[PDB]
Paper text:
Coronavirus trimeric spike (S) glycoproteins mediate viral entry. S1 adopts dynamic conformations in cryo-EM structures of prefusion MERS-CoV, SARS-CoV, and SARS-CoV-2, wherein RBDs adopt either a “down” conformation that buries the receptor-binding surface, or an “up” conformation that facilitates binding with host-cell receptors. Here, we report the isolation of a potent neutralizing monoclonal antibody, MERS-S41, from a yeast displayed scFv library using the S protein as the bait. By combining cell surface staining assays with cryo-EM structural analysis of MERS-S41 in complex with the MERS-CoV spike trimer, we have demonstrated that MERS-S41 inhibits MERS-CoV entry by blocking binding to the receptor DPP4.
The four different classes we identified showed that MERS-S41 bound to two distinct conformational states of the spike trimer. State 1 represented a conformation in which just one of the RBDs was “up” (42%), whereas State 2 corresponded to two “up” RBDs (58%). The MERS-S41 Fabs showed full saturation with one Fab bound to each “up” RBD regardless of the state of the spike glycoprotein. This observation provided the first indication that MERS-S41 could potentially disrupt receptor binding (see below) by occupying the “up” RBDs required to bind DPP4. The Fab-bound “down” RBDs slightly lifted up with an additional angle of about 25.4° in class 2 and 27.7° in class 4 between the long axes (yellow lines) of the partially lifted “down” RBD and the horizontal plane, comparing to the corresponding non-Fab-bound “down” RBD in class 1 or class 3 (with an angle of about −13.7°). If we dock our Fab onto the “down” RBD in class 1, class 2, or class 3, severe steric clashes occur. This analysis suggests that fully “down” RBDs are not accessible to MERS-S41.
Residue numbers in the entry:
A (entry chain G): 386 to 626
B (entry chain H): 1 to 221
C (entry chain K): 1 to 212
Write the structure that this text describes.
Amino acid sequence: SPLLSGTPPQVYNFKRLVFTNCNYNLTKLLSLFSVNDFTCSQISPAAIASNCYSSLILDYFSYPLSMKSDLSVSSAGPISQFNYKQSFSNPTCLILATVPHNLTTITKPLKYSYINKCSRLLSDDRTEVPQLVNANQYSPCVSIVPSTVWEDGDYYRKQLSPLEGGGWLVASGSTVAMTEQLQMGFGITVQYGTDTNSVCPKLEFANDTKIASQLGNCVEYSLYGVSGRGVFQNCTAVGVR
Amino acid sequence: QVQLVQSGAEVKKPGSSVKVSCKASGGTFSSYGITWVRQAPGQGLEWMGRIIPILGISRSVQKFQGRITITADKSTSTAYMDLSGLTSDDTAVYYCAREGGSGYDFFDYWGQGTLVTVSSASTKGPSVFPLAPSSKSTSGGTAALGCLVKDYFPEPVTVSWNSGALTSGVHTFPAVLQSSGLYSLSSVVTVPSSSLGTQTYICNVNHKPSNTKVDKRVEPK
Amino acid sequence: EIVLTQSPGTLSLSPGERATLSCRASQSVSSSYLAWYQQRPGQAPRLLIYGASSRATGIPDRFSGSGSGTDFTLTIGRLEPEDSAVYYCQQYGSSPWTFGQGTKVEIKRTVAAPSVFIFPPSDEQLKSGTASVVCLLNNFYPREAKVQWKVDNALQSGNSQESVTEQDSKDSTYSLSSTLTLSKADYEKHKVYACEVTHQGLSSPVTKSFNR
């Protein structure tokens, strides 16, 4: 619901959704948005659909399908270099989806925008050092850049307070034509605890595990750490629920 | 604060690539964008393009797109614009202006400027007409002597008394366009001294295409 | 790109009188996104006001910036000969940014009688090119003036070319030079060359004399 609410942010301003201990359905998210592009790194997409991890991180932003190749850790493209970075060590599943016309409560941004370059000038005006985005972190030059970039070619500069470092921070704003249908890119990073897997896919009771299906049959019961051989019979409720 | 200077005025044929260069004195470039402005004579200034050397980004106005290539090197500290296949009507003075940024599109400082001329004719070296000081003048109050500059096809020849040492009492007149392509402009100085003036050297003439400096001394006739 | 209306331009303004320049915009533009540029004759434009309110560094507060959204007025509390110049309002709210059509402020300290000097063609001009003739109107205020050449004390057609020097920043002195061009070979019948000036300055047409 938070992903659906309001409008998707730009790739540099990507919002972060964190799920630690809840049942999750990949199919429900796929139903909400038709997935134009599906890819995963370090694990199968089917495995990601049905597995338990210590934590689930979802990053949601409005990204066009045309520049999807540029936004890759392997890719040397500027958009990945200066905007959004996904940690290589955790398995990362990257999904690009296009909003359906039927879906409502989704607001299209005026245009898709990205930080073309992020750099910091040194104390010497002649010497400049480029700044490369660390994994996530919402981008180093995001503060200078506005949430939506007004022009395809833009110059943003701000002055660092002296000590430290007293060096100008320079950012570039670039935009691409808005698609007739909003396209949103989602980056998912999953962390697995060796002894802890709190977030799990939605669980539906199997017929054999359910007491009602095996009623009237001698069976072995293992409920809440209690193990015994017994026959369950449906009857009027007695005792305290 | 960085001072802005521009290349000397040049004349090129129409359809021939012309490069205008803007440089910063002391070979130092600050983190500021360089903006190129073309002003037609007696017309409003037009912003041809905006480039930032430190960023390395290049932007151009829609009218000047695909005919102009703008290159700014931060390490060089010099920004140069190349214009190719420009029309004869395109001739105008060209200026380079410091840019605060997209947030602040105002120019604190402006370059001296380069005149760009695009006529497929001939370039004529300036001819210095005699000083011919007026026969009747105040004996000590003022003396009127001017070395006229005429027969120069390409604007603008710069002519200064005492090689520019004297900036007082010297009048510079804009060239008047006659039916003939060649045009003439007037330089005259008023000196209390009847002859010689403040210094023996006077009437220095410099023409940007000619690159020749000539000094002549007035004789009271 | 926003089309912008501008002040009519040349105006006669006395020193010490407030001067207002109008910069109406056909399309609404940001109040904090307008700039004022002043250029002296033969001088590059220098920013006076940034954001349509704050004065630029090194710029006198007398050129105050006022108005917002559509109409932007530049008001000068005190007028000086140095102040007289061409003023352009540039709206950078919309790209491409559009410079103003420009307006001209004129300051005349006092009416000045013209000083007329006739430069007789020298022997060197007779030797080469065209001898020609030169007339000068130094210290003539206002700058506009009428000079007609006289050849051999006879009426001459006004094919003479006249140019006016840029006003001095403090002196505000205007000089008009009128030159008549004649072939060097054709210099026989004429014995006297004179320029007659009709102007507010001086009692009557101040004609002149060559002989020599």
